[PDB]
Structure 1
Amino acid sequence: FACKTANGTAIPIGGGSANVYVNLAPVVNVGQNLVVDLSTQIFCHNDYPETITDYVTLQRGSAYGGVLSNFSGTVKYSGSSYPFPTTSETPRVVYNSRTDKPWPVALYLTPVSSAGGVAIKAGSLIAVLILRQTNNYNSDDFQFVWNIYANNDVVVPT
C-alpha cells in the first residue's frame, strides 16, 4: 500500500509524510463554504489485492493557522460527514486494486463571525489529515500524514 499526489510527491510503503498545496476561493463570506476537495489530489492503491485487503481510515483531522483561528468546519470522508477538527477516527474504506483510487476526503470550512480581512495566508499550513492503513494479512499499522498548505490568500469581506 502506498500513496502519491497528483503531479507531486509520493509516500511509500510503510508510511511517512508529505506536503500538499491547495487552491482556495480567494474571497468567502460568513455563511459560505470553502470546499477543499482532496480526492482530486491524493491517490492510493493496494499492492497485492489478489491476497491482501487494505483498510484505510481518516484517523484524525486537525486545523492550523487561519483555518484554526477563523473557521469552523466539517470533513466529508467516503460519503459520511464529521466535525473538523475531528473527534474520532472514521470507519474504513477498502482498497482492493493496484489501480490508483482517490482518498475521498473533502473539507467544508466556513468563516466564524470574528473572521475579517486576510483570514488565511498564502503559503501557510492550514490543516493536517492523517491516513491510517491496516490489512487482513499481517500486523501492519501505518500512518500517512498529509500537511495541507494554502496556495493563495483568502479574504473574508468586512
Structure 2
Amino acid sequence: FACKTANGTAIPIGGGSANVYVNLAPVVNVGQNLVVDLSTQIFCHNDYPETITDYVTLQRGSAYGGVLSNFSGTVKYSGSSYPFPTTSETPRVVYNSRTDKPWPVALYLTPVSSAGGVAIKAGSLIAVLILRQTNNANSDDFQFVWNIYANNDVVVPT
C-alpha cells in the first residue's frame, strides 16, 4: 500500500509525508463556502490485492494558517460529514487494486465573522490530514501525512 498526489509526489509502503498544493477560489464572501476537494489530488493503491485487503481512514484533520483563524469547517470522507478540525477517526475505505484510486476527502470551509484579510496566504500551510492504513493480513498500521498548502491568496470581502 502506497499513495501519491496527482503530480506523482509519493509516500511509500510504511507511510511518511508529502505536500499537496491546492488551488482555492480567490474571492469568498461570508455567505459562500470555500471547498477544497482533495480526492482529485491524493491517490492510493494496494500492492498485493490478490491476497490482502487494505483499509484506510481519515485519522485526523487539523487546520493551519488562515483556514484555522478565518474559517469554520467540516470534512467529508467517503460521503459522510465530520467536524473540521476532526475529533476522532472515521470508518474505513477499502483499497483492493494496484491501480490508483482517489482518497475521498474534501474540506468545506465557511468564513467566520472576523474574516477578514488576507483570509488565506499563497504558499501557506492550511491543513494536515493523516491517513491511517491497516490491512487484514498483519500488524501494519501506518500513517500517511498530507501537508496541504494554498497555491494562492484568498480574499474575503468586508
TM-score range, shorter chain: over 0.9
**What per-residue deviation string (whole Å, max 9, x for no partner) do you get for residues 89-148 of structure 1?**
000000011111000000001100001121100000000000000000000000000000
SS at match of 1:156: coil
Which structure 1 residue ranges, 5 or more long, are not aligned? none
Aligned residues: 158
> What is the alpha-carbon distance in structure 2 between the residues aligned to residue 40 and residue 91 of structure 1?
20
> What is the alpha-carbon distance in structure 2 between the residues aligned to residue 11 and residue 146 of structure 1?
9
> What is the alpha-carbon distance in structure 2 between the residues aligned to residue 7 and residue 69 of structure 1?
29
Identity %: 99
Match of 1:137 in 2: 137
What is the deviation of 1:34? Answer: 0.7
1:43 equivalent to 2:43? Answer: yes
What is the deviation of 1:8? Answer: 3.5
**What per-residue deviation string (whole Å, max 9, x for no partner) do you get for residues 57-99 of structure 1?**
0000000011100000000000100000001100000001111
**What per-residue deviation string (whole Å, max 9, x for no partner) do you get for residues 8-41 of structure 1?**
4100000000011000000001121111000000
> What is the alpha-carbon distance in structure 2 between the residues aligned to residue 61 and residue 149 of structure 1?
14
What is the deviation of 1:7? Answer: 1.4
SS at match of 1:55: strand
Match of 1:11 in 2: 11
> What is the alpha-carbon distance in structure 1 between the residues aligned to residue 8 and residue 35 of structure 2?
21
> What is the alpha-carbon distance in structure 2 between the residues aligned to residue 47 and residue 73 of structure 1?
34
SS at match of 2:50: coil
SS at match of 2:62: strand
> What is the alpha-carbon distance in structure 2 between the residues aligned to residue 8 and residue 110 of structure 1?
30
> Larger strand proportion, structure 1 or 2?
1
Runs of 4+ in 1 over 3 A off after TM superposition: none
> What is the alpha-carbon distance in structure 2 between the residues aligned to residue 64 and residue 41 of structure 1?
19
> What is the alpha-carbon distance in structure 1 between the residues aligned to residue 14 and residue 117 of structure 2?
42
- The two structures have a TM-score, normalised by structure 1, of 0.99
SS at match of 1:153: coil
> What is the alpha-carbon distance in structure 1 between the residues aligned to residue 86 and residue 135 of structure 2?
23
SS at match of 1:66: helix
